[PDB]
Amino acid sequence: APIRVVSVPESDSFMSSVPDNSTPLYPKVVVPPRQVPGRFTNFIDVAKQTYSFCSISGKPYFEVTNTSGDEPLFQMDVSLSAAELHGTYVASLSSFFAQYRGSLNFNFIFTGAAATKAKFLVAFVPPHSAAPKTRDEAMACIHAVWDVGLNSAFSFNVPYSSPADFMAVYSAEATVVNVSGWLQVYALTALTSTDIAVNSKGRVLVAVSAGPDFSLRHPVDLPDKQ
C-alpha cells in the first residue's frame, strides 16, 4: 500500500516563481465587496490610454523662436533608454521588462499664443552613420509637415523597424537590437507673431503614449542604480 516514490535531486530547494501555491492556514475568510472605480488589470492598457510628457532638457517641451531654421529643435534616439523619454510612464513601466515591441505615439501640442504661428517638419530617421544636421537632409526620410494654425496638436507615430521581433529595453553601446534610429523635429519656419516684442517664442509640449501594437515581455529585477 505505501506508494513507491523517487525524490528528484532538486528536492528540498526554493525556486521563487514556482507555478503553485503554499498550504493555507487561515481558511474561510469572506472578503467585503470592493466596489471602488478605476480598477486596471494590465499595465499595457494604462500605458496606451494615457500620455506623459517628455523631458527635453528638463522641461516638458521644446521652443521655437523668431530665429530658427535649419538645425533640429528636438532630437532623441529611438530607445526606451533615451533621455527625453526619462520621466515618462511608458519608459518607467519598461524598466520592469527586458524586451519591447511596437510603436510609440508622440503628440506635440503648440502652446504659443493664438496670435502666434509656425510650421514644423517631424522626421523618423532610421539607423545610420550619423543623424542629419539640417532639415533638407532629413526630409528625404519619413516625415510630416505640421502647420500649426491648421491643428494646434499633431500626432506622429514612430514605427517599429527591425529584423528582430523585439528589441531591448535596456540599451548600451549600439547593437542591432539596441536602437531603432532617431526622432527629430525641425522648424519649417520660425515663429511669426503679431508683435515680436510681446510673443517672441512659443513652446511645443511633447507627450508619448504606447502605440496600438506596443508590448512588453520578460519581467526583470532592478539592477544597481545608475
Binding site: 539607423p127 519619413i142 514605427p159
Partner: protein, 200 residues
C-alpha cells in the same frame, strides 16, 4: 535544370516592420552579369571561389543598388546562373552550392574571394542546396534562393544570408587554357524599408 534552395521565394512583407514597405518590381531590381574568375590547371581540389550575395558587388548592381542604398532594410531572394566556358576536351568538375550563413572568410567579410576549403567541407558541401558542374556533361548551374535569415528581413550592409560557393572537386586537365567561371545574379521579390537621409 532549376534547383530551389530550401523553398520557393515569397513576396510576403516582413512581419517586423510597421513602416511602409516598397516592392521593387522586376524592371527595377533587374539582373546583373559578372565574371567570377578563371579556373586554372594549377588550382587543386578544395579550392573555392566564395561569392557572398552581394556585398562586394552591390556597387555594380545598378538600379537595385541605387534603391537598396537609400533604405535601411531589405528582404529578397536571388536567381543565379553560374556558367563555365570550356571545350569538349577539358576534364574537371565543380560543385556550386548556395550556403545560408556561410562563414570561414577570416572576416574578409562580404567580399568575393578564394579560399581552400577544409576537406570535410568540400566532401560534404553537397549537403547544402547545390548542383554539380561536370565538364563532360554540362556547362551551367541554376539556383533560385528564397530570403533566409534569423529575422524576417536584414540590412545587407551588415549581413549576407546567401553566399555562393563554387568549389573544385576534380581538377582541370586537358587543353592548357583556363576555364572562365561566369555568373548572372538577379534580385527576386525585393522589398525595401525605411528611407535614409539625403547624402549632404
Amino acid at each position: 535544370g532549376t534547383t530551389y534552395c530550401y523553398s520557393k521565394p515569397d513576396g510576403r512583407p516582413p512581419s517586423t516592420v510597421s513602416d511602409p514597405v516598397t516592392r521593387l518590381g522586376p524592371t527595377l531590381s533587374r539582373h546583373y552579369t559578372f565574371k567570377v574568375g578563371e579556373w586554372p590547371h594549377s588550382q587543386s581540389h578544395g579550392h573555392a571561389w566564395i561569392c557572398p550575395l552581394p556585398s562586394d558587388k552591390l556597387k555594380k548592381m545598378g538600379s537595385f543598388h541605387e534603391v537598396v542604398k537609400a533604405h535601411h532594410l531589405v528582404k529578397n531572394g536571388w536567381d543565379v546562373v553560374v556558367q563555365v566556358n570550356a571545350s569538349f576536351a577539358h576534364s574537371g568538375a565543380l560543385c556550386v552550392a548556395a550556403v545560408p550563413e556561410y562563414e570561414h572568410t577570416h572576416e574578409k567579410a562580404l567580399k568575393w574571394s578564394e579560399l581552400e576549403e577544409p576537406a570535410y567541407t568540400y566532401q560534404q558541401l553537397s549537403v547544402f542546396p547545390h548542383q554539380l558542374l561536370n565538364l563532360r556533361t554540362n556547362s551551367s548551374v541554376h539556383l533560385v534562393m528564397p530570403y533566409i535569415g534569423p529575422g524576417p528581413t536584414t540590412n545587407l550592409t551588415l549581413h549576407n544570408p546567401w553566399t555562393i560557393v563554387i568549389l573544385i572537386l576534380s581538377e582541370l586537365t586537358g587543353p592548357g587554357q583556363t576555364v572562365p567561371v561566369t555568373m548572372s545574379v538577379a534580385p527576386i521579390d525585393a522589398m525595401v524599408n525605411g528611407p535614409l537621409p539625403n547624402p549632404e
